[PDB]
Amino acid sequence: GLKTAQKTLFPLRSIDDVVRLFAAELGREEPDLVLLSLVLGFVEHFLAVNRVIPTPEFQPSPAPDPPGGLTYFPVADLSIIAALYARFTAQIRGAVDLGVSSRELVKKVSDVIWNSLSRSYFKDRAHIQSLFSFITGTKLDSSGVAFAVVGACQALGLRDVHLALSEDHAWVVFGPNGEQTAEVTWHGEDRRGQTVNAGVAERSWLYLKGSYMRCDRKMEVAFMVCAINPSIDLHTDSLELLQLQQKLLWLLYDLGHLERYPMALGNLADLEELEPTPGRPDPLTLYHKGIASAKTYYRDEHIYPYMYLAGYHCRNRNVREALQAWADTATVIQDYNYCREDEEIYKEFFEVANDVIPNLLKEAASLLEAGSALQDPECFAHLLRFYDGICKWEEGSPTPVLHVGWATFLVQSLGRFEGQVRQKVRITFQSEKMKGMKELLVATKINSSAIKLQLTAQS
Numbered sequence: 001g002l003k004t005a006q007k008t009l010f011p012l013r014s015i016d017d018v019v020r021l022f023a024a025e026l027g028r029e030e031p032d033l034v035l036l037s038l039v040l041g042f043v044e045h046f047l048a049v050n051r052v053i054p055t056p057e058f059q060p061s062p063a064p065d066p067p068g069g070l071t072y073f074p075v076a077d078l079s080i081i082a083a084l085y086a087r088f089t090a091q092i093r094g095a096v097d098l099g100v101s102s103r104e105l106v107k108k109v110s111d112v113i114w115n116s117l118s119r120s121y122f123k124d125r126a127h128i129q130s131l132f133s134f135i136t137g138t139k140l141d142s143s144g145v146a147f148a149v150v151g152a153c154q155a156l157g158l159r160d161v162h163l164a165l166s167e168d169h170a171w172v173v174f175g176p177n178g179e180q181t182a183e184v185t186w187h188g189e190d191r192r193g194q195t196v197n198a199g200v201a202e203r204s205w206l207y208l209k210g211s212y213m214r215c216d217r218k219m220e221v222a223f224m225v226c227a228i229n230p231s232i233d234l235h236t237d238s239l240e241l242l243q244l245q246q247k248l249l250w251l252l253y254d255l256g257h258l259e260r261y262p263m264a265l266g267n268l269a270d271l272e273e274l275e276p277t278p279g280r281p282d283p284l285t286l287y288h289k290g291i292a293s294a295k296t297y298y299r300d301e302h303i304y305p306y307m308y309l310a311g312y313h314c315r316n317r318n319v320r321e322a323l324q325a326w327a328d329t330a331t332v333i334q335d336y337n338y339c340r341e342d343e344e345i346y347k348e349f350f351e352v353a354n355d356v357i358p359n360l361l362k363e364a365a366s367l368l369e370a371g372s373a374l375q376d377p378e379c380f381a382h383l384l385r386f387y388d389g390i391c392k393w394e395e396g397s398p399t400p401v402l403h404v405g406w407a408t409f410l411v412q413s414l415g416r417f418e419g420q421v422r423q424k425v426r427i428t429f430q431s432e433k434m435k436g437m438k439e440l441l442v443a444t445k446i447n448s449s450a451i452k453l454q455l456t457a458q459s
């Protein structure tokens with residue numbers, strides 16, 4: 001059952017109503033993860049899953065239809081939300097018979113979630129992150145399973161069970177000092193029931209060498225807020241869900257609950273880039289706050305803080321700063337071993353190397369044709385440092401990184417820098433691969449076939 005202080009806040013008729021419910025919950029020692037996730041999932045379902053109103057091309061009279069379209073909000077009645085809340089609690093409270101939780105108990109709660117899920121659905125669909133999705137559709141995405149287990153543990157009074165988050169995987173931590181770990185969901189087959197010890201030991205990006213986020217209840221709220229998915233379709237985001245996420249992230253920010261959450265700070269900066277809130281820090285300040293957070297709390301072993309920053313510089317045509325931030329990105333990855341479950345960060349580096357940097361340099365070339373970053377040997381050195389970090393990442397790893405297609409874009413990006421610029425650098429490389437082709441990189445003529453042979457040499 002819901003406390004009367006919670007019920008008095010319903011019905012929710014606006015974004016602001018939702019923000020007040022979140023503000024009220026975050027003022028308590030145990031913000032109700034199940035209540036809050038159900039509200040967000042309900043609002044998201046009727047704003048993005050079933051879009052009620054779609055998202056026109058002057059005259060003396062008023063226009064027949066709203067000339068700028070409509071935004072809307074689906075009213076969240078207490079009756080609807082409490083009914084779903086009671087459904088979840090009856091389910092969880094019934095399936096387990098009851099300040100440190102044991103491994104046997106955590107596995108039990110995890111199994112309750114796991115075995116409730118549909119046997120066959122597309123695990124990568126949008127809008128199956130929330131407990132609304134779990135209750136009304138018996139479907140959860142990978143990290144949504146972990147969040148639901150944490151939520152179920154809170155509903156059972158297991159105050160020591162918490163969400164653990166890397167940059168692409170989720171599990172639970174528990175025990176005396178939060179040092180116990182259990183896999184509860186799949187990634188990518190599954191390691192459910194295992195500890196994460198072997199993943200931390202293999203130095204894969206997926207477990208961040210142990211420098212992963214151990215949430216408290218307030219960061220679990222921040223997680224579900226980051227989990228809002230505004231996509232209506234591939235080309236259309238719900239303005240309302242973006243605005244809801246933005247107001248909620250600022251609320252969490254002001255309470256200090258994004259201090260140890262770098263990707264949440266980058267998320268907020270991305271939103272401020274599109275819709276700046278007057279009186280708030282500008283996006284660059286927030287991007288640098290996320291980098292400072294990763295340095296302070298996670299040993300500077302996170303990748304995305306620098307990709308957030310680089311992307312902003314890229315969209316703002318700050319070529320020098322973008323290239324330096326990508327070089328900084330590769331400098332963090334170079335100390336990891338590329339493992340089989342690391343595909344997500346691989347795809348991000350792939351798009352940077354083979355699309356975003358080529359586009360950035362083509363943009364810069366269009367300015368020069370009409371000082372330019374393409375005439376700056378520091379920019380060229382940053383490009384080489386980016387590839388050096390990727391090569392060192394690959395070096396000695398169980399999985400190859402570079403393939404022939406990467407060499408095509410490298411040759412093209414090298415060519416964007418005139419030989420007279422390239423011949424000015426004096427660089428030392430970490431990777432054997434880059435050491436083995438330093439002279440090819442600074443030669444007046446760029447030997448495409450040799451660079452392809454060298455970049456594709458087997459690790």
Ligand SMILES: CC1(CN2CCC3(CC2)CN(c2ncnnc2Oc2ccc(F)cc2CN2C(=O)C[C@H]4C[C@H]42)C3)CC1
Nearest residue numbers: 143165166167168169170226227263264304307308311348
């Ligand atoms: C490349 C760039 C953009 N890019 C950066 C990376 C994200 C996508 C956008 C930001 N984001 C996250 N934000 C906050 N919390 N977790 C996140 O990721 C995880 C982490 C562990 C998991 F197990 C599952 C997910 C997926 N996930 C989310 O996306 C939100 C909540 C539901 C969780 C991943 C420029 C930087």
Ligand SMILES: [K+]
Nearest residue numbers: 336392393395
């Ligand atoms: K390596």
